[PDB]
């Protein structure tokens, strides 16, 4: 009753510990959130503000699937996971996962 | 150096040629109300109630009326700002304005016009039509009356 998403955003629009902004080349403010699909500093994409998020991260070596209440998992498998707990965004996530896979 | 109440007033208070004497007895019968506009024209025949040099000519609303005293709200431009000044005068210097009554007449006429319009349901313009462009005219002039002109030689 005292805490809501908008409020949270307001609190942490500036003062985050995931916000990293390029000092050289001023345009660009990134969120290093464990639940950010696109690493933008927007309340409509950030994991801290959004109640339900299903981001794919790298964490420590192996690619990890994160769900929001917080869950952690591990292409077909990823798709299945998405299908299970998930409510365009999915496509984006899939794309991201592909990219992640490429990295070792 | 010398700024008295009647400084630079050799001509402003001086009565006009062949119009000295005193203020006429009928001038005191001029009726005034709480809202009338009034010109302050100083008759230096009556030294009592003499307003300051500046207010001679300038008009203003009457805000106060006494036995023989008339209080007038006169706008004075003071450097950066025009301010209201309450000048307590006598009747001898106070004269009723004329513009106000010009306005009044117009208003009266306008009312009549309005009434007339109503009588017949019509769109009659009331606003004063200022001197605009002259309409097309055909002026009949005989060749006998048209007198030709040429610049005059020097002498």
């Amino acid at each position: 009753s005292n805490v809501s998403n908008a409020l949270v955003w307001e609190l942490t629009r500036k003062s985050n510990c995931f916000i990293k902004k390029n000092k050289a080349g001023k345009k660009g403010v990134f969120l290093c959130d464990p639940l950010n699909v696109n690493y933008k500093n927007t309340p409509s994409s950030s994991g801290l503000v959004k109640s339900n998020s299903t981001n794919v991260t790298l964490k420590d070596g192996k690619v990890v699937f994160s769900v929001k209440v917080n869950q952690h998992f591990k292409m077909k498998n990823v798709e299945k996971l998405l299908q299970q707990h998930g409510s365009k965004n999915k496509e984006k996530l899939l794309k991201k996962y592909k990219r992640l896979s490429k990295l070792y | 150096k010398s700024r008295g109440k009647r400084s630079g007033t050799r001509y402003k208070f001086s009565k006009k040629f062949r119009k000295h004497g005193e203020c006429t007895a009928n001038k005191y019968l001029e009726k005034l109300n709480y809202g009338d506009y009034v010109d302050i024209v100083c008759d230096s025949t009556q030294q009592k109630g003499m307003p300051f040099n500046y207010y001679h000519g300038k008009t203003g609303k009457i805000f106060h009326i006494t036995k023989r005293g008339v209080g007038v709200l006169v706008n004075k431009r003071v450097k950066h700002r025009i301010e209201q000044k309450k000048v307590c005068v006598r009747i001898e210097h106070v004269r009723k304005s004329r513009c106000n009554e010009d306005f009044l007449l117009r208003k009266i006429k306008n009312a009549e016009l309005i009434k007339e319009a109503k009588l017949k349901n019509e769109h009659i313009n009331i606003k004063r039509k200022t001197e605009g462009p002259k309409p097309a005219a055909m002026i009949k002039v005989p060749p006998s009356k048209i007198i030709t002109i040429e610049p005059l030689p020097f002498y």
Binding site: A6, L7, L11 | -
Partner: protein
């Protein structure tokens, strides 16, 4: 060049954004701004403006005053864009429905007792997004002690402004220029 006034740019003399960093308050202002922009019902805009305003221009509204205001129309909801304080001077409190930015605890308690309703701004919005059957009330702004020093300065004739003094009594600004007997007066 162009012979203009202040050249081109149109002066706006008022607040633009709240300087305040109060997250809740910011949220509220955002909400009301949104309301203003979508539904130009004026009321919303006014509310937004009030929210934006500084603390002096949200003077506290006293419960008694509120009651007085409500005295004509009942059941409609008085909205106060500031704090509402209680008044020991009042004996009875009617069934009031009041939306405020802030209730002092005691005032709130009083309202509750009256069997009334205390609404926050969000609640009000939810209830009445067009502000139907609402009545905007303000506290007495120029009743503030600061304002008593303003206007024509004490020294100018017929001015009713409080001089800035140390204390009060004979020894303190009550002689020359304050009585016919010591040079002048006022």
């Amino acid at each position: 060049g162009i012979a203009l006034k202040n050249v081109g740019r149109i002066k706006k003399h008022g607040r633009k954004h709240l300087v305040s960093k109060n997250p809740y308050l910011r949220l509220l202002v955002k909400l009301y701004n949104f309301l203003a922009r979508r539904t130009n019902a004026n009321f919303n805009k006014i509310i937004a403006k009030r929210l934006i305003m500084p603390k002096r221009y949200r003077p506290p509204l006293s419960l008694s005053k509120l009651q007085y205001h409500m005295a004509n129309h009942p059941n409609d909801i008085a909205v106060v864009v500031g704090s509402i304080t209680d008044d020991k001077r009042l004996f009875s409190l009617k069934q009031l429905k009041v939306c405020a930015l802030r209730f002092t605890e005691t005032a709130r308690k009083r309202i509750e007792d009256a069997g009334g309703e205390c609404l926050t701004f969000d609640q009000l919005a939810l209830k009445y997004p067009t502000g139907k059957k609402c009545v905007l009330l303000r506290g007495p702004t120029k009743a503030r002690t600061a304002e008593k020093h303003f206007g024509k300065a004490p020294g100018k004739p017929k001015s009713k402004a409080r001089p800035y003094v140390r204390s009060k009594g004979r020894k303190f600004e009550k002689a020359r220029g304050r009585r016919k007997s010591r040079a002048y007066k006022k």
